[PDB]
Amino acid sequence: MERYENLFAQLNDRREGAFVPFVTLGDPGIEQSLKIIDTLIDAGADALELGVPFSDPLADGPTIQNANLRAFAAGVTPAQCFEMLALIREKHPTIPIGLLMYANLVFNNGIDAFYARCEQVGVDSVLVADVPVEESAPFRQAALRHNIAPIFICPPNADDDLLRQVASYGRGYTYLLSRSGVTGAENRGALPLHHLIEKLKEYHAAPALQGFGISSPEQVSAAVRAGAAGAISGSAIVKIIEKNLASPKQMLAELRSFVSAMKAASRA
Amino acid sequence: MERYENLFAQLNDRREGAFVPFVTLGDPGIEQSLKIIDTLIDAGADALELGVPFSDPLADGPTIQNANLRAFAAGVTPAQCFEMLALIREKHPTIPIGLLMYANLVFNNGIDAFYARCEQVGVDSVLVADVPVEESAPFRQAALRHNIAPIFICPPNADDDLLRQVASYGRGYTYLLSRSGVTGAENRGALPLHHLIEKLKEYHAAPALQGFGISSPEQVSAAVRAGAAGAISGSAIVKIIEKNLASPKQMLAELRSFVSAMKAASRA
Amino acid sequence: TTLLNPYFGEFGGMYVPQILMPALNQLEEAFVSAQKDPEFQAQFADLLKNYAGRPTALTKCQNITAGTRTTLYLKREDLLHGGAHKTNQVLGQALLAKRMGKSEIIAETGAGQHGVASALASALLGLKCRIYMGAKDVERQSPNVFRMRLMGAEVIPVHSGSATLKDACNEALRDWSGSYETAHYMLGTAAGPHPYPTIVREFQRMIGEETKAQILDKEGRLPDAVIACVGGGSNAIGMFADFINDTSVGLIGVEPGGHGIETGEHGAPLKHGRVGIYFGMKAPMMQTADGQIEESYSISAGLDFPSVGPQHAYLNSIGRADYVSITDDEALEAFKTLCRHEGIIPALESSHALAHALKMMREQPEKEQLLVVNLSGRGDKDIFTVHDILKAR
Amino acid sequence: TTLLNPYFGEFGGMYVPQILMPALNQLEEAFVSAQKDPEFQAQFADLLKNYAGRPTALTKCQNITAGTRTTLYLKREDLLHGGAHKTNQVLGQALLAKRMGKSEIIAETGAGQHGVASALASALLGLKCRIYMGAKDVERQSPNVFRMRLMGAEVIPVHSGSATLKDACNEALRDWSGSYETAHYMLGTAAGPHPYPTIVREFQRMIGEETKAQILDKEGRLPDAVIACVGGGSNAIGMFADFINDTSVGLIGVEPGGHGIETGEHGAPLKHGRVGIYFGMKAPMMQTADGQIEESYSISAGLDFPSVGPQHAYLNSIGRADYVSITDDEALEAFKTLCRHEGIIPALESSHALAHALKMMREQPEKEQLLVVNLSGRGDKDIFTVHDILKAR
Ligand SMILES: O=P(O)(O)OCCNS(=O)(=O)c1ccc(OC(F)(F)F)cc1
Ligand SMILES: O=P(O)(O)OCCNS(=O)(=O)c1ccc(OC(F)(F)F)cc1
Ligand SMILES: *Cc1c(COP(=O)(O)O)cnc(C)c1O
Ligand SMILES: *Cc1c(COP(=O)(O)O)cnc(C)c1O
Ligand SMILES: N[C@@H](Cc1c[nH]c2ccccc12)C(=O)O
Ligand SMILES: N[C@@H](Cc1c[nH]c2ccccc12)C(=O)O
Ligand SMILES: N[C@@H](Cc1c[nH]c2ccccc12)C(=O)O
Ligand SMILES: N[C@@H](Cc1c[nH]c2ccccc12)C(=O)O
Ligand SMILES: [Cl-]
Ligand SMILES: [Cl-]
Ligand SMILES: [Cl-]
Ligand SMILES: [Cl-]
Ligand SMILES: [Cl-]
Ligand SMILES: [Cl-]
Ligand SMILES: [Cl-]
Ligand SMILES: [Cl-]
Ligand SMILES: [Cs+]
Ligand SMILES: [Cs+]
Ligand SMILES: [Cs+]
Ligand SMILES: [Cs+]
Ligand SMILES: [Cs+]
Ligand SMILES: [Cs+]
Ligand SMILES: [Cs+]
Ligand SMILES: [Cs+]
Ligand SMILES: [Cs+]
Ligand SMILES: [Cs+]
């Protein structure tokens, strides 16, 4: 399928940025997670980034470490995550769905077989957080064989060789890292990225989504103004889940308000 | 101690043969076995031959195979047998006590330590049924260090070299085998043995006791007439135990009658 | 006094009742004489070739090692008449019986394979054969008992002790104690009192001699290791003997691990037992703390014995041979793998040796190694056992 | 692009987030440069000699091998400053940090021995040290935590995942992801992403180089085998490296068997795990069927990790090194034996290597063999653990 290409063409025709929330699948349980994801979509999410709970999420700060732990406390397995993904796609035919994976969960039962299962349930992209471009070959090859976009990371300190590699190998979107460190709303990126955004377009890269530390509407607007196609927010969304574990109704209301405000900031 | 030497000197002064029953220790249980052994002594046994139950008694026919099995069904162990031997000696200070062992029970916790335990409980001899003179050195050396007589077998087909070996190495008594095969009352020896008895005396052997297939008073008398110092009977005694398992009282009465008759046949 | 050394270092000897020493001395003298007699050797060679079908094939197994640096050959004792290596030494011992002028054979059996081998040799060579078998084994091995009776042998169930192989071993020696002037005891493995460990090795050593010639012809070198299962020790010492002086050749014996060494339900006395004296020998034993002979266990009846031949204990002690164990489940997997990938149904005994070779390959798949497994027998006899286990899973 | 091969056959690599690749490339370049720099080598040699006390003794242990044909030497890394071999490589990595112009050190620790080693090197060489330790390990290792704080290091408990060593490994990499321009990550073993397996080997290889010189001086030959415990792989590869090209020398690595391999409560991924990708490397892992990283177990905290360095996995795959396991109970017996017969209190880690050498001797006591055990550390730290187990028996 071409779900990212179709999304970005439609947003380009509206001079509009993408707003892409991240959540951990099955946080705080399978049923509540499915309700959370439908609320994110209804409130204006353009695409999703969905984490499979992993024992050792070494690119994640405490907020998403704790989301992984809540999903494990609910007994969530990768098999249950793929059942959730099939049902999300059965409800929502066009929204691009990206997975946030760690290498062992992709390699575990065979890299090719992992990407074949992603294609079967209707996933559009996979980002393997602990596979740098140097180690990416079997992952990106299996992704492309199964119509999955391999998502590459463009760090703030990217040199020209890395920009050309990320631009050539990637599909779907290019992940534009705000900053060094790990995921977290408590740490905001304070480096201008418009130069990297311009070099990525010059090299015909997949459209850029800015991610890490995006927690406010002004940051979504700023990402679009800098030339990015949109912005990803995870910890800020997951903090609303963590704060409202005792009130599932208030959790969905606060997620709706937050996603609505973040999506409004993307509009022309 | 000198219990066999003292016994044979006393019997020689009365022109009398020794009658020596065999039983399996703890057949059919520890308490009944102790009563059986006291009955054998009271009825006129001059010495005892006592078997320690062993998993693989390969010199024994079915009667004594089945005695071993009854003792095992009662949970009888070698440790319990040595407790019985200590109590037999505590009751009966002069009767010679011989053990019928298989090699593994002697070797198990160290040959020297086995014979040291025999000395401690007041055993007088050990016959290791599956150790021929060729393998006897560590057994006979440990026996003599601990004042235990090592009992050697003189088969009916013994050549002059074997007669001289048995005569030199043995103490206490020389075991004069009636016949080939294994223990059993169902098989009587039908070879004259007076030539072997005469050669053993010429070589200053320990006094001969005839054993295997001795079940009748006339055989005890015949052994003495042939020049033997006495006779051993096992299967015939054990058959009385086997026949009377349901009447402990009748068992002791029949053992008394049998031992009395066998001992009477030894008298001048 | 003996013509040959009854010991392998501290192991072996002649721990029999005095009455049996002339029988052992007579047998040793007849064997030493036979080994110098070209006519005896020619009649043995003729039987081995024209009756049993020697030499046996050495099969290169390419499918099961594909994608590794292991080259695996199987020495095909499964193709010998009777379907196991036991046939080699029963023909030699039957000829020794005839050399001594004897007309009768006594044999023990557990799995029944030695009983059948003794019965077939006796039928061919005009000897009256009687076979002792523990009553529990008689009940479990109806097919082999029927084969023994078809060949005219008497099968005598043994009800004493644990009514299994050690009890049949005892009964055979009890009988021989009273009958050796007329009967030869055809002991079924490279164990028991001298001279049996020596005789059985020399009457099995053609396994290793042929293997050496075949591997040199095919590969131009000696194997890195030869691997054999160890029940009593005959097929393994038959494979090992001709390589003992080739110091570069590994000698690997595989004991049955049963349900696992830690369960105590195994048949691995060499590595997990205690030295004792039983069945005429000083050797590693499975035994209770107070010295009663213990019950062994294996999925394979041919390996299910609580002791081991003394030459294996000696080769282990000096570090010339290495001994390992393989569990029931590992053996069953090797059985299934050989059926599916080579079209050969191996004995479950032999499957223990194959399982260890497969582990040597799989653990270190880029290690260059030239291995020979002694495929001691065929596994037609085991398909009911394997069916029942796969069904119960 | 890299200066050196990041792989040992299929094992190893650089499985880190993209943000960390410049940190690994910088470290690799600084290491390659340092290895060619005589001044760097001279300052490292000076610290190893005058601060840490190299060379370490090679002790012949005659009482524990009496009556066998085993000759056993112990390489005495227990005598190194800090009481374990870890001191060697922390001094080298501290010098690399200074070469790159860095002022801060990050380190992970489980047992706390690497934390103490990192803290002492940092105190000596004027670096600010912060140590990540799983909260469960902090609770179990009060003495080592206090030693780290006495030496001026910051100790940061880690509460995420399983709150143990793998979780501290993750946290150290999270910190480095945001701090590598100022901080060096002093990884504690021969594992993790390239270039750490290579660096840690080269900064431990004096163990094997000294052993080779010492054994030649004392025995006039190479050892038949060198034996070392395997936690992450540093002391073992340090002993092995200088012998890899001496094809006659056995290389034996001993993984912790814990309560027994069959229980699943062990730390033996090389022989009983499954290849996975974690902690920056492709290596054998203990992991669930669906690929979560599993909990390892050993009586010895220094061996308690669910993976292993990639060079060990490679040496195993080609058959150059052999890997075995030793259970808690076997290690405890070896600990008691060395105390009573040699007056040396070994680390429970090192006791696993000694236990396997004692098994090599006891199984084949007439095999002539010249063995070296790497005594990776002293066991003063373990006397409470050993007291508690002997008390509970
Ligand atoms: O809003 P934040 O700060 O929580 O950021 C959320 C990001 N979630 S995600 O799935 O895009 C994401 C993307 C990349 C990650 O690591 C990598 F860069 F190393 F690959 C980790 C998570
Ligand atoms: O009366 P029987 O026929 O039952 O004979 C009883 C003999 N009991 S014993 O302890 O003397 C005895 C003596 C020797 C034995 O075997 C050996 F000769 F090989 F050593 C076995 C038992
Ligand atoms: C009898 C048998 C064995 C085991 O006996 P060994 O004497 O140890 O060789 C092994 N394999 C087969 C096929 C057998 O028949
Ligand atoms: C740390 C440690 C080990 C295990 O770590 P390796 O990297 O495998 O060497 C072993 N022994 C001691 C004494 C240790 O301190
Ligand atoms: N301090 C900012 C910018 C920065 C400095 N050095 C870096 C190296 C890599 C990435 C970002 C940076 C950050 O950590 O994000
Ligand atoms: N037939 C008798 C006598 C005999 C013949 N040959 C023997 C050999 C050994 C002992 C005794 C014999 C017996 O078996 O006892
Ligand atoms: N039980 C097997 C092999 C065997 C025969 N005799 C033995 C003695 C010891 C060990 C094994 C055996 C069989 O009878 O065919
Ligand atoms: N747990 C030990 C050794 C160690 C440190 N880091 C490791 C990484 C992997 C395996 C073991 C280790 C310690 O901290 O002293
Ligand atoms: Cl797409
Ligand atoms: Cl006396
Ligand atoms: Cl000897
Ligand atoms: Cl059957
Ligand atoms: Cl070897
Ligand atoms: Cl590779
Ligand atoms: Cl402690
Ligand atoms: Cl090797
Ligand atoms: Cs592209
Ligand atoms: Cs805007
Ligand atoms: Cs005498
Ligand atoms: Cs009389
Ligand atoms: Cs091959
Ligand atoms: Cs070899
Ligand atoms: Cs066995
Ligand atoms: Cs020694
Ligand atoms: Cs070697
Ligand atoms: Cs480990």
* Catalytic hit among B16, B27, B46, B60: B60
Instruction: For residue C366, give the nearest of D260, D271, D318 by CB distance.
Output: D318
Among C85, C133, C165, C230, the mutation site with the greatest number of ligand 7 atoms within 8 A of its Cβ is: C165
φ/ψ (deg, to 5) at B57: -80, 80
**Count of all residues that appear for chain B in the document:** 268
Phi, psi of C64 (to 5 degrees): -75, -20
Q: Give chain C positions within 8 Å (CB) of B152.
A: 18
Taking alpha carbons only, the member of B164, B237, B224 closest to residue B193 is B224
A49 tagged catalytic = yes
Q: Which two tokens stand for residue B168?
A: 């030199």
DSSP codes, A112-130: HHHHHHHHHHT--EEEETT
Please tell me whether residue B95 adopts helix, strand or coil conformation: coil
- CB burial of B86-109 (b: ≥16 within 10 Å; e: otherwise) equals eebbeeeeebbbbbbbbbbbbbbe
Q: Which CATH architecture has domain D53-85+205-390?
A: 3-Layer(aba) Sandwich (3.40)
Angstrom distance (rounded) from CA A200 to CA A167: 6
Q: Is C30 in the pocket of ligand 7 (CB under 6 A)?
A: no
Mutate to test the interface with C, among D325, D367, D368, D370 (most CBs of C within 10 A): D367
Is residue D113 within 6 Å of ligand 4 at its C-beta?
yes
Contact A132 D166 (CB under 8 A): no
DSSP-based helix, strand, coil % in chain D, nearest 5: 45, 20, 30
Token pair for D370: 């010249």
B74: which 2 tokens? 């009662």
* DSSP labels, C262-323: GGTBS--HHHHSEEEEETEEEEEE-B-TTSPBPPP--SSGGG--SB--HHHHHHHHTTSSEE
In angstroms, rounded to a whole number, what is the distance separating the alpha carbons of residues C236 and C374?
8
Cα distance between residue B163 and residue D249, in whole Å: 58
Tokens of B140: 């006979």
Q: Residue C178: name the closest of C17, C1, C2, C14 by CA.
A: C17
Q: Which residues of A touch D17 (CB under 8 A)?
A: 58-59, 129-130, 132, 153
Nearest to D331 by CA among D311, D303, D351: D351
CA–chain centroid gap for A261, Å, is 18
- Tell me the one-letter amino acid at C163: A
Q: DSSP character for B52?
A: P
Of the residues A54, A58, A64, the best mutation for testing chain D's interface (the one with the most D CB atoms within 10 Å of its CB) is A58
3-state secondary structure of D226: strand
For D86, phi then psi, to 5°, come to -55, -30
**Helices and strands, counts by H and E, chain A:** 12, 9
User: Cα–Cα–Cα angle for C189, C193, C199, nearest 5°?
Assistant: 55
Determine the residue of chain D that is closest to A66 in CA distance. D160
Find chains touching chain A: ≥3 CB pairs under 8 Å. Answer: D
CB C333 within 8 A of CB C390: no
Q: Which of C2, C177, C290 sits opposite B108 (nearest CB)?
A: C290
Is residue D229 within 8 A of residue D376, CB to CB? The reply is yes
d(CA A213, CA A234): 8
Alpha carbon of C94 to those of C85, C156, C207: distances in Å?
Answer: 15, 20, 19
Residue with tokens 């071999």, as numbered in its chain: D85
Task: Report chain A's C-alpha Rg in angstroms.
Answer: 17
Would you call D128 helix, strand, or coil by DSSP?
A: strand
Q: Does the beta carbon of C111 lie inside 6 Å of ligand 7?
A: yes
Q: How many domains does chain B have?
A: 1
At D69, list the tokens.
Answer: 């044909």
Residue D4: count other Cβ atoms within 10 Å of its Cβ. 12
Partners of residue C11 in chain D, C-beta under 8 Å: none
Q: Which of C25, C181, C182 to mutate to test the pocket of ligand 6 (most atoms within 8 A of CB)?
A: C181
Both structure tokens of C59: 């099969």
Is D114 noted as a catalytic residue in this protein?
no
Structure tokens at D363: 């199984």
In whole angstroms, how far apart are CA A109 and each of A24, B48, C250, D17, D277? 21, 74, 37, 22, 12
- Helix C113-125 to helix C86-99 angle, to the nearest 10 degrees? 40
Inter-axis angle of helices C142-150 and C113-125, to 10 degrees?
10
DSSP C202: H
Residue B235, token pair as written in the block:
């299967």
Q: How far apart are CA C60 and CA C219, in angstroms?
A: 11
Write phi, then psi, for D64 (nearest 5 degrees). -75, -20
Annotated resolution, angstroms: 1.0
Q: How many CB atoms lie within 10 A of CB A31?
A: 12
Cα C320 to middle of ligand 25, angstroms? 13
Nearest Cα neighbor of D302 from D188, D151, D150, D162 is D188
Length of chain C (residues) = 393
CATH number at residue B97: 3.20.20.70
Q: How many other C-beta atoms are found inside a 10 Å radius of the C-beta of residue D293?
A: 25
**Quick one: which of C19, C1, C10, C13 has its CA closest to C197?**
C13
Query: Which residue has a Cα nearest atom 1 of ligand 7?
Result: C110
* DSSP β-bridge partners for residue B100: B51, B127
CB of B158 closer than 8 Å to CB of B195? no
* Cβ-defined contact of D319 to C9 (cutoff 8 Å): no
Q: CA nearest A151 in D: which residue?
A: D18
Provide CATH code, domain D8-52+86-204: 3.40.50.1100
User: Cα separation of D287 and D309, whole Å?
Assistant: 16
Residue B86 structure tokens: 């200590």
Nearest to C254 by CA among C313, C325, C303: C325
Report which protein residue has its CA nearest ligand 4's atom 14. D302
Which site among C7, C314, C364 would you substitute to test the D interface, given the most D Cβ atoms closer than 10 Å to its Cβ? C364
Domain that holds residue B61: 2-268
Enumerate the β-bridge partners of residue C277: C282
Residues of A in contact with D291 (CB under 8 A): 78, 104-105, 107-109
DSSP designation for D56: P
C and D: number of Cβ contacts within 8 A:
35
CA distance linking residue B60 with residue B66, whole number of Å: 10
Q: Which two tokens stand for residue A7?
A: 């999304």
Nearest bound ligand to the CA of residue C366 = 21
How big, in percent rounded to 5, are the helix, strand and coil portions of chain A?
50, 15, 35
